[PDB]
Design a protein around this nucleic acid. Sequence first.
RNA 1: GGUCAAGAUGGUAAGGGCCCACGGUGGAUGCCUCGGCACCCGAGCCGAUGAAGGACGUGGCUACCUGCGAUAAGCCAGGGG
Length: 67
Amino acid sequence: MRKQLEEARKLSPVELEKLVREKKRELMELRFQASIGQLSQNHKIRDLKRQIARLLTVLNEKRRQNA
RNA sequence: GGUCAAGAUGGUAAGGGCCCACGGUGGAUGCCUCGGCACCCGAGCCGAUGAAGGACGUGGCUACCUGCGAUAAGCCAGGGG
């Protein structure tokens, strides 16, 4: 989702904040899943993690730019 | 053909001995390497932006060899293909 790279570019303080937070929760959802759907899940897990990771890469970039 | 006195030699293995055949355990080993070792050139500083060096982690499903460490089979940007 290079596109997601984009949204990223887009948001800022409280934004990225709750974005990555909620998303994170999402992956939690996954954690839960650890014994249900599973099969097509796989990716929600790996990628989702990579995604939120990005989320952080950004926050860093932005507020870093700041202070 | 039968009886007796005499003499001389024969095969008969439980196992074993030399030989031949055919196995088994044992790895010599001929060769063969992502491994050393030797010389020469290249190279020569790491650390509190808490390093060298490790403890416990993560890989959907992993004790372990791996790479990261809590953003953890990795996110970012540019160089390469």
